Amino acid sequence: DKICLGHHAVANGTIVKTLTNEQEEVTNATETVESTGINRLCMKGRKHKDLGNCHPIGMLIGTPACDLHLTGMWDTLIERENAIAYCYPGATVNVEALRQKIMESGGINKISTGFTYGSSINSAGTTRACMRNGGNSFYAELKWLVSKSAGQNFPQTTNTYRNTDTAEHLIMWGIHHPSSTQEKNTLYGTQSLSISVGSSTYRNNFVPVVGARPQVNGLSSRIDFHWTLVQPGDNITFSHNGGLIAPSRVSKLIGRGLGIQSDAPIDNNCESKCFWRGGSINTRLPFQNLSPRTVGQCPKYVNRRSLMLATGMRNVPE
Amino acid sequence: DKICLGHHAVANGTIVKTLTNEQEEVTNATETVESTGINRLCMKGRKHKDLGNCHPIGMLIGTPACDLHLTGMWDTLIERENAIAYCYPGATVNVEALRQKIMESGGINKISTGFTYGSSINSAGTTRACMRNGGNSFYAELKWLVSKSAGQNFPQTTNTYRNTDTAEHLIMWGIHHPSSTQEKNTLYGTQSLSISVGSSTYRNNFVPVVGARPQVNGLSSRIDFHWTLVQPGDNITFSHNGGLIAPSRVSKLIGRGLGIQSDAPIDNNCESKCFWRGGSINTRLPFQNLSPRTVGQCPKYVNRRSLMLATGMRNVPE
Amino acid sequence: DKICLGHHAVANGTIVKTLTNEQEEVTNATETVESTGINRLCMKGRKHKDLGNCHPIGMLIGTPACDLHLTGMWDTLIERENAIAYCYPGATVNVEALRQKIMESGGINKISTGFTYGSSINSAGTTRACMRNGGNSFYAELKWLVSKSAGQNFPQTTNTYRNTDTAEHLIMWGIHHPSSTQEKNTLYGTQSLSISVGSSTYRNNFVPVVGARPQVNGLSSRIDFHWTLVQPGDNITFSHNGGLIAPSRVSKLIGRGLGIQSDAPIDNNCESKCFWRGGSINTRLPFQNLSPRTVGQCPKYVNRRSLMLATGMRNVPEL
Amino acid sequence: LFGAIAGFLENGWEGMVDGWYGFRHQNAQGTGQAADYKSTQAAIDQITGKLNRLVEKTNTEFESIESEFSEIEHQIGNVINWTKDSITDIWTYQAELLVAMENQHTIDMADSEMLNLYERVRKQLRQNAEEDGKGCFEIYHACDDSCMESIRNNTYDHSQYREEALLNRLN
Amino acid sequence: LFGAIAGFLENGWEGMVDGWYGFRHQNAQGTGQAADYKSTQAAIDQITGKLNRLVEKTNTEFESIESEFSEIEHQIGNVINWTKDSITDIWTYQAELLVAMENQHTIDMADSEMLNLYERVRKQLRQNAEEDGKGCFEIYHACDDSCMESIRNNTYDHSQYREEALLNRLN
Amino acid sequence: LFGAIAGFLENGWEGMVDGWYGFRHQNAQGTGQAADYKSTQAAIDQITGKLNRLVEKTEFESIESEFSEIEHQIGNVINWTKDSITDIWTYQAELLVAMENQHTIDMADSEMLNLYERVRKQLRQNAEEDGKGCFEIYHACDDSCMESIRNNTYDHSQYREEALLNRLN
């Protein structure tokens, strides 16, 4: 008479690593590194904005691509690869910093500068580079000031915007750089051009400069965009001789949101907290090997294809 | 006839986490995460300077609020929340880098520039914005140069500081940006203004940006500051036309110390190596959850209220 | 009649740390932190370039110290402590970013701009500051343009560089800041001076500025250097009327390579993947205490002399 | 390591799908097999606790510091590459160590639960049985099917069979 | 896990306040309790070994990289935020692993010290006692108080009671 | 922790040099020391497994110029971050060695107990323990009988009846 003690085993064991063994066979194991992600931006439960071909900078100055995206509210803001900021070709000072501020925002409210110009100024300069509805147009949030009478000196002008609101305002402007002495004379006169800008927390001077350049969107002339934050109760003033691209409106960035850059289409029936440019990651696992660039609440990225965690005893077959 | 083996138990166990069990009852445990700090700044053993309402930038240029902090020696430098750097409106280019150098420093010395000015110059200008002892005054370490003779061109002027020391010296200067063309002509004449600053390692040029129209708009009178380091044996030269606010002293930063931004009151009885916005942390524990922003020798911040480390066996009551 | 079980021991054990005990004696143990290194640069298997007293910025503008480093292919680039960038005194905007870019590169090719100037311009200006064969010279890859006729207004001038290649090019130019009003007038004339540079992707403009400054290499004058990348199929146009230091060649940075700052001597017979200011680190160990600042593939740096890992059982010698 | 699961027990039983740990008995009226519920649940409960710990991570929200679609300033970019790579090296290392350490413990735990079942049976048998080197107990009295069940059941009374058992052992 | 604590031992003894591990005895004269010094100290020493490692304080000095009282540039500000949060996620994770791992081992080590004490007694008694499965040894001679102290003091000579014990065990 | 090393065994034998774990015996013929190959190999192989993990081995580039000035604010970010990384690796390095050493010692202790246990179940009713790691054998066991204990060729039933008469009288 006999009674025997034993443990189960399986025909197919799983190999796992241990402190003392590279190749240790156990009854069962599971993955701890996620390798699969969702090819959509899972947006259910998020007030989200897909910018499409609107670049975040474009929202502020109102490039035609961005007409659907000039005001709004969102907790998630999606930026896309084909994104357009500029129709009249140009560049922006500290552009990445500005883009990051926008991409962190919870929305944008627009507010008139209230700027008015006298009879000497034509403030409706438009161009073929900025088509709006089959017709020549310009940045929606800016006005291209030029001499009403061609070749005449642009008048000495002062414009002041007061932030009478209780939160900070972001205001942008441009400095026109003509592409020929002839073009510059027609627009602003033969006089020396000076544009000077100032608040309690900004002072700068700009001088339009003529120069031959390659055509971008058909234009050899450029616009240099600048920006600063105007604090509550402060006033900002522009003194200009010609060449200022004045703000018709200023921006208020509201609250907070999560900025995402991605290739993936949105799925609004899908819920997620982790994003990468391929889409979303939904997993209970602590690690992942999909991408080292992720946004939101995510498992940590690791340089391993697989990490097997044993869920059973040593497997010893018959 | 029996002898029994057993272990102790306690009436009230403490719950701790293990690899296999959350909520495991054990006889005893202690806290690994410090959750209480001291709401004072503990300065025992530290030769320290409490800057009070003086901002570190003000130390270098001599704002009236900083009259007692123009020179010093310290282990520890403490910066307070609404400290004053400026008496006259304006700002410092590259301010955060400079503030860090001062807050990393172990003391400051002032060395006279030795600058001397011709008959044509009035170097004694003061403003009612910088009140000292109830009188119009100016930044102690700088001089506001204007034409001794109003409306007449400020003479072409040269001044050089030579560092004859064996350590680098920090030099600061100001640029006056006039409120209107009328104010600029009186102080400095009708000429074009240029300020050139040249050393062996550094070069730059400045033009005052004249503001306009009311004193209540954004383009009004300000002094903006610039700085650089002058190497041992090297000379730095100012070539200037009006608009330069010139140093009567330059600064030498000595040794090293620990810089603390806080509003906690100084306790000289208490000793510490870790500080944060709201006081000191004196713990033997490896972790803390008081603040993610600390300076000195600190336990590592963790996002947990409590991590209990068992100091006893499983508690098994009857 | 009996049989006994026992373990071994040694006369001299080693002490190691454990969770319970900081002084635990074990039969044997082994180091986990590398402590020695090699006071040479182990360059075996690496196609390398030692810049010597050539600074990497000097390769792009052609300072004389860099004459043997104007072009190259390397997988490893070595920079030495007081290397020379400038013969004619000045500085470069965003210099550390440009230096890091060269020090990541696997080589450099030079491409002529093909720039040509009219008769009223002298493009061959030279200085005592830049010397070859003990005589006055200039940056090899730049040209100092001045009025051929002294004191005369420098003519309004346009020059365009066209990138007809499939890869981006790095173009550098200088803006001359004269020591004095008289010097400025002689070189360029009394007219107001303006330089504008424009490409599809870049726009900037410069004004030469006159100021008294200390002598560096005998000169109180300065050249500020500027750079941009020019994309494939793009053109960059210089509009200038005095003060431009014009590029005669552009740079193309090729591939990828490891950059090392060290004063250690090259050793061509030993190989390595980890480097620091003093030589190299070759170890199988996972931690080192040699240096916090290393490049390549390195053990992680730790603030410890020694961590001994037990390689034996507990040591219990006879009483 | 405890002496059992890859030790004095020769191998596992592929045949026992009933549980992790079990009994096999041979007695007059044929042979049989049954899994011990307490021990397997002891091991399994511990495993699930490890798994709970692994997925029970609540999380910090991170924002982007690298532009996916536009270039970044070179020096800041290099600082960012260095930092992110340093963080990844740490996480990869921690992930490798957690799983190696955790697997070593899991194995030695399951071996422990096995030894404990074996010891529990041994004490229960007292003087009525002896150990062969493998995991078997050679029992020195006739042990009924209901009696075998009594051993698994933890109900078996050694005193009831001791005299017969002691006699068989000595004779 | 060793067998003893939360194992074949049914429960702990709250009454015993002079040590971690102990003896309880039953004889013709009554009932006694005593604590084993060496085994409890062996357990306390290992815990304080752990506690010493915890409060180990060799520390790096850190300086501020964000201003409490002023704005910092937006891009570098975001980089510092990303970096600090990454460092914190790591430390938070390590603090949890540290205590979870530590606690597991502390519980198990205490169990082992108990088993070792139990094993030491088993071997002393030799053929004079049998174990009841609950941490008690049934002694097959009479053990007066001095004889009990003999067992706890590790001075019990089994061959002094062997004859008697063997025939009480067998009859 | 397992009973044996620094436990019920009073000490190790310096004399044993062909193994970590071994047998010492006394009988009519004389005394002998033989190391045990299997128990010794199992411990060592576990140790070499740790060492393999240890030496298992990303490319980094410079973000901190050795020979030129570095902008001050970014310099402080770089120093903070690098020191924060070094504190983590230093801590990890200490945790690794401590925890691995604790385990190494106990695994060694484990293999010893496992050797002891194998012999016990092997000797069965023929011998009894002295509590210091020895088995007093109650029969006459010559060097071949001893090699039989080490080989695992020992048939307890062969000496049982005699050994039991000796254990009971």
Ligand SMILES: *[C@@H]1O[C@H](CO)[C@@H](O[C@@H]2O[C@H](CO)[C@@H](O)[C@H](O)[C@H]2NC(C)=O)[C@H](O)[C@H]1NC(C)=O
């Ligand atoms: C700083 O200025 C002083 C004078 O302005 C320079 O020193 C003179 O140097 C020459 C060359 O050695 C000597 O012959 C004179 O005796 C020095 N004069 C004095 C009073 O020092 C010095 O070279 C300048 N430093 C730099 C770096 O330009």
Ligand SMILES: *[C@@H]1O[C@H](CO)[C@@H](O)[C@H](O)[C@H]1NC(C)=O
């Ligand atoms: C394998 O592991 C998974 C998760 O641990 C579990 O769901 C499953 O039951 C295990 N399978 C076996 C063979 O037990």
Ligand SMILES: *[C@@H]1O[C@H](CO)[C@@H](O)[C@H](O)[C@H]1NC(C)=O
């Ligand atoms: C580049 O220069 C060539 C030659 O003039 C010209 O064909 C081309 O249009 C220029 N490219 C651009 C983008 O302007």
Ligand SMILES: *[C@@H]1O[C@H](CO)[C@@H](O)[C@H](O)[C@H]1NC(C)=O
């Ligand atoms: C802004 O303008 C308003 C109206 O002139 C004035 O009341 C206020 O003082 C100005 N703000 C500042 C800070 O100058």
Ligand SMILES: *[C@@H]1O[C@H](CO)[C@@H](O)[C@H](O)[C@H]1NC(C)=O
């Ligand atoms: C000790 O161990 C080290 C590494 O495990 C080895 O190189 C050496 O040969 C061993 N030496 C002894 C046995 O002292």
